[PDB]
Every structure is written in C-alpha cells, then in structure tokens.
Amino acid sequence: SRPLWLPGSTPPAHLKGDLPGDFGFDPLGLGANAESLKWFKESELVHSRWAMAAVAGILVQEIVRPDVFWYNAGKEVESPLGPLGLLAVEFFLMHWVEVRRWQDLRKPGSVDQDPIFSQYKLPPHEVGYPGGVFAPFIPGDLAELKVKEIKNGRLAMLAFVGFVMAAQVTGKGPIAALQEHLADPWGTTIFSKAAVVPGQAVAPPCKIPASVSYKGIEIPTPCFLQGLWP
Amino acid sequence: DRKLWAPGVVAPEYLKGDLAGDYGWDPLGLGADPTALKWYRQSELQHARWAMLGVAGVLVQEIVKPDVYFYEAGLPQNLPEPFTNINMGGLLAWEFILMHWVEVRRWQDYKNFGSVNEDPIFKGNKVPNPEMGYPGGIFDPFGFSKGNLKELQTKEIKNGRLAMIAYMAFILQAQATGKGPLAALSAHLSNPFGNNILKNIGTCTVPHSVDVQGLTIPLTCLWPGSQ
Amino acid sequence: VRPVWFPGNPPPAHLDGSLAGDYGFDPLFLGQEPQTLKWYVQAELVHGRFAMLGAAGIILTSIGAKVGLGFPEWYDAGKVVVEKNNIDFPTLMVIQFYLMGWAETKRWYDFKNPGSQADGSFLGFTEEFKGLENGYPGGRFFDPMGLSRGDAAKYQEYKQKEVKNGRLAMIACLGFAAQYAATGKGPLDNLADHLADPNHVNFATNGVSIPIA
Ligand code: CHL
Ligand code: CHL
Ligand code: CHL
Ligand code: CLA
Ligand code: CLA
Ligand SMILES: CC(/C=C/C=C(C)/C=C/[C@@]12O[C@]1(C)C[C@@H](O)CC2(C)C)=C\C=C\C=C(C)\C=C\C=C(C)\C=C\[C@@]12O[C@]1(C)C[C@@H](O)CC2(C)C
Ligand SMILES: CC(/C=C/C=C(C)/C=C/[C@@]12O[C@]1(C)C[C@@H](O)CC2(C)C)=C\C=C\C=C(C)\C=C\C=C(C)\C=C\[C@@]12O[C@]1(C)C[C@@H](O)CC2(C)C
User: Fold this and answer.
1) Pairwise CA distance, residues B40 & B19, whole Å
2) H-helix or E-strand containing A218?
3) What residues does ligand 1 touch, defined as CB less than 6 Å away?
4) Whose CA is nearest to atom 4 of ligand 4?
5) Cβ(C180)–Cβ(C75) below 8 Å
6) Which residues pair with B210 in a beta bridge?
7) Taking the CB of the first residue and of the last residue of chain A, which one, N or C, has fewer CB atoms within 10 A?
8) Where does chlorophyll b 6 bind (chain B) (predicted)?
C-alpha cells in the first residue's frame, strides 16, 4: 500500500507506516517491542541530526579551509581556551541539554517549562519533536517535513561513515577523495585496491598514524577494525 | 502419450507434461516437492540461457579471433586494445553492481510473482510476464511470444539443454588438449585415430595458478589429470 | 515427524521436541529424569554461550596475528598480557572468582528457587532478575533490545539459532585445542596451510592423528 525498501515484500507486523520514514525495513525485528521502538525512534533522530550537522561541517571545512584535514582537526586547532578548558564547558553544557531531552523521553511534558523565566513554556508536542522556540519557522506541512528530515538524515549517517573509511584508507578529505575517483574511476574503487581470494588477501594500508603526540601525551589513533578490512 | 527418456519406463506422478521439454526424467526424484520443482525449473532456464550465450560466444569469437584461446581470454593482457590491461578491480565493480540489481529483480519475481513487473523510475511501464521465467514485453520486442508459445518453449529448452552439454565439452577439451572447440575439431579430422580422447584424457594443460595484476588466482582441472 | 540425529531411529520418550535444538540425541539416557534434564539444558547453554565468546575471540585475534597487527596466538595471549601490562596473575584470578562467583551464584539460586533473585534484595532491583525460562533470563538488563519481548514466533526461532551456533562453537573450541596439540600452530595458520595444498596437508598427513600412516 506504501513504498517499501524491497518492493513486493510484506512489511513486518510491528511496522505499519505510522512513523515517518517507515518503509517496512526491519529484518532482525529489533522494533517488535513497543517500548524498544520508542527508544530506538529517539536515537535515530538524534543520530541523523548529529550526522547531518557533522557531514555539512566537514564539507564546509574543506571548501573554506582546504589545508586542514578534518580528521586531524582535533590536534590541529589551537585556541586560548586550552584542551581541558574546552572540555569542561562542553561537558557541563551537554550534560544539561541531554538530561532535559532524556527526561522528556521518559515522562513527556514535564520539562517543557523554562526553569529561570516563568512565563515562557514549550507548547505540547511529541517526543523528539519539540516546538515553540525550537521551531520559529516551518516551510510547510510537518508530515512532509518529517519525511524529508529522516530521509536526508539517513543518507547523512551513511555519508559520515563513508568519510571515516575513505579518510582512513585514502588519507584524504571527502571532496579530495571524490576528485581522485573522477580522475581514475576504474583504478580507484575499493575493488581496485583490495581483494581476498582463497590463499591470498590484499588490504589497503592504514594511512592514519598509529599514535598522535598532542601536548606532551600520546593519543592512540587506530584504524577502525583494520584487521577485518577486505 | 508423450515419448519418454527411455523405452518402457514409467514417468513420475508429478511430471505430467505441463512443462516444456518434459520427458519424465527424474531418477533422483528432486522434483517431488512442488515448491522445489519451480526453483529448479528457473535454474534450468538460467543455465540453459547462459550456456547458449556461452557456446555462441566461444564459437563466434574463435572465428573472428582464432588466436585468443577463449580459455585464456579472461586475462587482462589479452583484452581488446581499448580495454587492454584494464584494472580488473574496477571492471568487476561494474558487473557486481549491475548484476546485483538485475538478479535481485528476477529473484523478487520468483518470491512474489508479478510484484516487480512495473518500472520503478518511470511509472506506467510494465511487462506482461505471462509465466515465471518468461518476462515478455520489452524482453520480447519482436513479439514471437504471440502464437504457439508452448512449442517455442520446447524449442528453447531443448536447444538450451544441448548447449549446456556442448559448453562443458569445450571446457574439458580445452583442459585436456589445450585447444578451442573448432581447433580440436580440425585436429581430430587430420588424425582421427592418433588424436582422440583415448590419448589426451591423461593430461591437464591448465597451470596451477596465474598472476592477474599481482593477485594470485588458483586454477584446477575437473579431474586429477597429469599436469 | 521431526528430524533426528540418526534417521530412522525413534526419538527417546523424554525428548519430545519442546526444547530448542532437540534432535532426540541421548544415547546414554543421561537426561531421562525430568529434573536432571533442566540442569543439563542450562549447562549446555552456558557451555555453548562461553564457547561462542571463546571462538569469536580466538578467530578475531588470529586474524590480527596473520595480518601483522601484532596480536599473539590464543595459546600465548595469557603470558603476553600479564607480562606486558605488569599484572599480578594471582590477583587477577581472585578478582575473576569474586565477580564470577557473585554473578554465577545468583544464577544458581534462581535455578533452585525461580524468581527468588527478583525480590529487591540486590540493590532494589526487582524485575531485571526475575527470569523468563530455564536458561533464558530475559529482562531489560540481559535482553536490553527486548528481542524476547517482541514477536513470539521469531523468539522461538532465535532459540533454535542460539543453541546450534553454540554447539558449533563448542566443537570449534575442541578443534582449536586438538589442532594446536597436533600441529603447534595457530588456528588460521592451519587454515592457510590447508588451502595451499589441501590434498597433501590435513590431519591424515600430520603424522599424529593417524599413527599407522
Ligand atoms: C561464466 C563465468 C565465467 C567462467 C565460466 C569463467 C571461466 C574461466 N575464467 Mg574467467 N570466467 C567467468 C567469468 C569471469 N572471468 C573473469 C576474469 C578472469 C580472469 C582474470 C581469469 C579467468 C580465468 C578463468 C578460468 C578459471 C579456471 C578456474 O578453475 O577458475 C575457478 C577458480 C576459482 C578460485 C573460483 C571457483 C569458484 C567460483 C567459480 C567462484 C565463486 C566466488 C564467489 C562469488 C565468492 C563469494 C564470497 C563470499 C564470502 C560472499 C576459466 C577459463 C583464468 C584463466 O584464464 O586461466 C587460464 C584467469 O586468469 N577469468 C571475470 C572478470 C571480468 C569474469 C566475470 O564474470
Ligand atoms: C563526536 C566526537 C568526536 C569524534 C568522532 C572525534 C574523532 C576524532 N578525533 Mg576528536 N573527535 C571527537 C570529539 C573531540 N575530539 C577532540 C580532540 C581531539 C584530539 C586532541 C585528537 C582528536 C583526534 C580524533 C581522531 C582520532 C580518534 C581516535 O582514534 O581516538 C581513539 C580514542 C580515544 C583517544 C578516546 C575515546 C573516548 C571515547 C570514544 C569516549 C569517552 C567518553 C567520556 C569518558 C565521557 C566524558 C566526556 C564528555 C564530553 C561526554 C578522530 C577523527 C586525534 C586526531 O586528530 O587524530 C588524527 C587527535 O589527536 N580529537 C575534542 C576536544 C576535547 C573533542 C570534543 O568533543
Ligand atoms: C553471615 C554472613 C554471610 C555470608 C557467609 C554470606 C554469603 C553470601 N552472600 Mg550474603 N552472606 C552473609 C551475610 C549477608 N548477606 C546479605 C545479603 C546478600 C545478598 C543480597 C546476596 C548475598 C550473596 C551472598 C553470596 C555471594 C557469593 C560470592 O561469590 O560473593 C562474592 C563477593 C563479593 C563480590 C563481594 C566481596 C568482595 C571482597 C571480599 C571485598 C572488596 C571490598 C573493596 C572495597 C572492593 C573495592 C573494589 C573497587 C574499588 C574496584 C554468598 C553465599 C549473593 C548471592 O549469591 O545471592 C544468591 C546475593 O545476591 N548476600 C546480608 C544482608 C541481609 C547479610 C547480612 O549479614
Ligand atoms: C557537529 C558539529 C560540528 C563540530 C563538532 C565541528 C567542529 C569543528 N569545526 Mg566545524 N562546522 C560545522 C559543524 C561542526 N564543526 C558546521 C555545521 C559548519 C557549517 C556552518 C561548520 C563550519 C566550520 C568552519 C568554517 C570551520 C569549522 C571548524 C571547526 C573546528 C574548530 C571549531 C572552533 O574553533 O570553534 C570556535 C567556536 C566559535 C568561534 C563559536 C561558535 C558558535 C556556534 C556557531 C554556536 C552554534 C549553536 C547551535 C545551537 C548549534 C546547532 C547545531 C549542533 C547541535 C550540531 C572543529 C574541529 C574550523 C576548522 O576547520 O578548524 C581547523 C573552521 O574554520 N567548522
Ligand atoms: C575405471 C576406470 C578408470 C580408473 C579408475 C582410472 C584411473 C586412473 N587412470 Mg585411467 N583410463 C581408463 C579407466 C580408468 N582409469 C580408461 C578406460 C582409459 C582409456 C580412455 C584410461 C586412460 C588413462 C590415461 C591415458 C591415463 C590414465 C590415468 C589414470 C590415473 C588418473 C589420472 C588421469 O589423468 O586419469 C585420466 C583418466 C580418465 C579420465 C578415465 C576415466 C574413466 C571413467 C572413470 C570410466 C568410464 C569411461 C567411459 C567408458 C568412457 C571412455 C572413453 C570414451 C571415449 C569411450 C588413475 C590411476 C593417468 C596415468 O596413467 O597417470 C599415471 C593417465 O595418464 N587413464
Ligand atoms: C551456464 C553454463 C555456461 C556458461 C558459460 C559462459 C557464460 C561462458 C562465458 C565465456 O565463455 C565466453 C563466452 C568467452 C570466454 O572468453 C570467457 C567466458 C566467461 C568463459 C553451463 C552450464 C552447464 C550445466 C550442465 C552441464 C548441467 C547438467 C545437468 C545435468 C545433466 C543434470 C541431470 C540430473 O539432474 C537431472 C536434470 C534430474 C535428476 O533426477 C538426475 C540428474 C542426472 C542428477
Ligand atoms: C566439546 C564440548 C562438549 C561435547 C559434548 C558431547 C559431544 C556430549 C555428548 C553426549 O552427551 C550427549 C550430548 C548425550 C549423551 O547421551 C551421549 C554423549 C556422547 C555422552 C564442549 C566444549 C566446550 C568449550 C568451551 C566452554 C570453551 C570455552 C573457551 C573459552 C572461554 C576460551 C577462552 C580463551 O580463548 C580466548 C577467547 C582467548 C585466549 O587467548 C585465552 C582463552 C582463555 C583460551
């Protein structure tokens, strides 16, 4: 009745199309439990929203600041606030924000009131979709917008993972790697730099240094599951 | 009343001539399960159709390019000038992506008949798909399906079965004699008695392994022939 | 009806197919008594679950060794970890038996008196230790994703999958030990040798398994 991930298939019983982006994909049945789906619904939005912001940032960094490698931005960046000064502000600010979001997930409608200012309050809303101050402007129908958000978000989540493995294998940024693909599309695919057959296995070399020296300490920098690479 | 594979042999109950090219031949009784018979029928069509392309390719390629020795044609250095020494990794990438799409579409048709007839991108386009394994429509531009379809199915499977046997003759002959199909045929005519299977059967001419752009690929013959 | 380990042999009376992975294999009638069968059903799962962790760990580290990442073989990891990290073996052993003893004693008295560990005695937790079946704790701690609280049909399918991968892992862990004793090389070192020359490199030619060879 609705488009599915695999056309012609029957969606699992626990999936019925109520949620946005519900295309009936759940081969392992992780969403069968009602409470588990409610939690997994929140994490998908949070993961997607973080990924979209992260993917946009990495692309903009390379265009604006081509010299700096987004992978090495952790050590490359220098600021007066120092390493542990930045972390301190980040921890406390994120601890407040995340706990309040977490509380609404458990008991919705309890953390809508503004603590400091009495008059201001968050209108009634659904879990994971705060309104009011967070949404000053809405281009159109929310139902359509929610589907747009998740579909772009799901793509962004894959996009970020593409950056990491491309960065670890090719040792380059996202746009820089793409330019390499366009130069020699046949000789740059993962098939054209790695292969495993009975008796032999060839894998790309991890182009990220094993360890990083950062202000008198050594930070391990391992390639993700480098032993299982193709 | 149809003729059977052997004289005076009783055909299995589940083989009653519904399918084309039905001689009532199933010594292992693999078609007893009705669902299994459908799947095996599809694989017979796939082997039949791929094998016919394989036989045609080997023979035609031999005529146009006698020296290529199709058995070795897979090596990158033997490819035509435009594609000579192409990166096999990138070349495989095209086939995997394109074949994965096409074959999953065919597979989904078997799982749920008639579900994948319509074009996904351009709405409206469809194929008739009168029977599983016979999409028709765009796959039959000349419209030969119209008419005596049953007879055409019989002709397809009978020729396809012959191709399967014929192609594996090419492979074993190349492994034993080291020559292509037409080349081996000429050799037999020259010296029918001196040059035949009785002599060549004991030798396997395939090297143990080959190096394809730095990757070692194991190779084997279909019998423990004297290397 | 249902398949059995020895085709044509009727299954034993005490094995009725209700349990997961039941193929009517009990030639010595070790589980004829119903109460003893409960004990062994859980013993098999604990053995199977540990073997799966052991086999996966041994395989993964062996891949690290072959690829050159520097991992030691499973039969040398214990010595390497202790020496490289400067760990007192007797202290590490004692810590293990405190943590295993507490966790595994709780599993022991849940078998004796089911539901006894969910009385709130342990830090006030009253529902995470109740238990679903014999050998299947369930709950939001041991089953955080709630795959045992969703579809009932698929949960029974997983129980079949868990036991069979567990039995396969148990056999594999015996293979690692037997292969090391016969060959003295790592797991994947043996696999590489077999793929090189399968005909002339296997147990029938190692000079140990078949002494009359
Ligand atoms: C119908 C398909 C097909 C057939 C029949 C052949 C047949 C042949 N090719 Mg050719 N090729 C085929 C497709 C292709 N070849 C090549 C590329 C090559 C090369 C580069 C070479 C050959 C060679 C050979 C020979 C292999 C002898 C042997 O024992 O191999 C079988 C050996 C094996 C190790 C594989 C046996 C198992 C099975 C066939 C593969 C299945 C793999 C699974 C999909 C992997 C799945 C992994 C899991 C984890 C998901 C033989 C003449 C060799 C040759 O000319 O030798 C003189 C050679 O060097 N082929 C490509 C890439 C474009 C193909 C793409 O479809
Ligand atoms: C989403 C978060 C995040 C991610 C994905 C990365 C990712 C990366 N950083 Mg970056 N960083 C992140 C946040 C931060 N980094 C830094 C500071 C640095 C530095 C100084 C360096 C990197 C480096 C790297 C790279 C290698 C990482 C590695 O191998 O670590 C291996 C693993 C670890 C070192 C520890 C892992 C910790 C664990 C995942 C989470 C721990 C949680 C805390 C205990 C909870 C309390 C903290 C609060 C904030 C929640 C990689 C691209 C390195 C680089 O450039 O390599 C080329 C590098 O030198 N990052 C800061 C500022 C404090 C961050 C703040 O959020
Ligand atoms: C009369 C004494 C007495 C005895 C012999 C026991 C014996 C036992 N009690 Mg205990 N209890 C006793 C009194 C009491 N118990 C309880 C309440 C409970 C509960 C609720 C439970 C037990 C359990 C157990 C068993 C734990 C088995 C094990 O391996 O523990 C291993 C021991 C430990 C892990 C803790 C001790 C570790 C070490 C010796 C001390 C370390 C201290 C350091 C500060 C550590 C710091 C490390 C950090 C920094 C990394 C064991 C049979 C458990 C059990 O098995 O129940 C079925 C259980 O759940 N008892 C109360 C309160 C009413 C008691 C009051 O007198
Ligand atoms: C997940 C988000 C994220 C993270 C963690 C980073 C992290 C980083 N960025 Mg990137 N960036 C992002 C998103 C992100 N960026 C996005 C979305 C964009 C497009 C607008 C950019 C554009 C960008 C540029 C152009 C540059 C960086 C740079 C940097 C580095 C230094 C930052 C600095 O000095 O700030 C100092 C901080 C300030 C001066 C004040 C910032 C105040 C902000 C705007 C408040 C935003 C609040 C708002 C509620 C956030 C909503 C989204 C959020 C929830 C994800 C650092 C590695 C620099 C770099 O490459 O260094 C090597 C750099 O030049 N980023
Ligand atoms: C029971 C049948 C049988 C068996 C078990 C063997 C066993 C063996 N043969 Mg012998 N062989 C046989 C029959 C058999 N042969 C016959 C009938 C012929 C005449 C065609 C030969 C001709 C022959 C040669 C030329 C060589 C061997 C060799 C070998 C060795 C294996 C390597 C090899 O290349 O074999 C290849 C052999 C075959 C593929 C024959 C398969 C026969 C099948 C199993 C029986 C049915 C055949 C059927 C009637 C069709 C016959 C041909 C047809 C045109 C009429 C091995 C000791 C090799 C050797 O001496 O190594 C030191 C070797 O070089 N055999
Ligand atoms: C698909 C196939 C061949 C495909 C070949 C292709 C694509 C070749 C391509 C290329 O060559 C070219 C063109 C040019 C070269 O340069 C490159 C390559 C790539 C090499 C053969 C199948 C070949 C398939 C064969 C031979 C199958 C035979 C099956 C039989 C006899 C089964 C019999 C029974 O099962 C029944 C039916 C019923 C039971 O009751 C009883 C028993 C007896 C068990
Ligand atoms: C084979 C086995 C049991 C087999 C039992 C059989 C056939 C029983 C058969 C029968 O009884 C039946 C059913 C019914 C009866 O009527 C008849 C018989 C015939 C009597 C158990 C293996 C059980 C195997 C187990 C539990 C293995 C656990 C392994 C672990 C934890 C390994 C850990 C580590 O390897 C790491 C990960 C990293 C390393 O560096 C360090 C170490 C510590 C080595």
Assistant:
1) 12
2) strand A217-220
3) A 198; B 71-72, 74-75, 88, 91-92, 95, 210, 212, 217-220
4) A54
5) yes
6) B217
7) N
8) 220
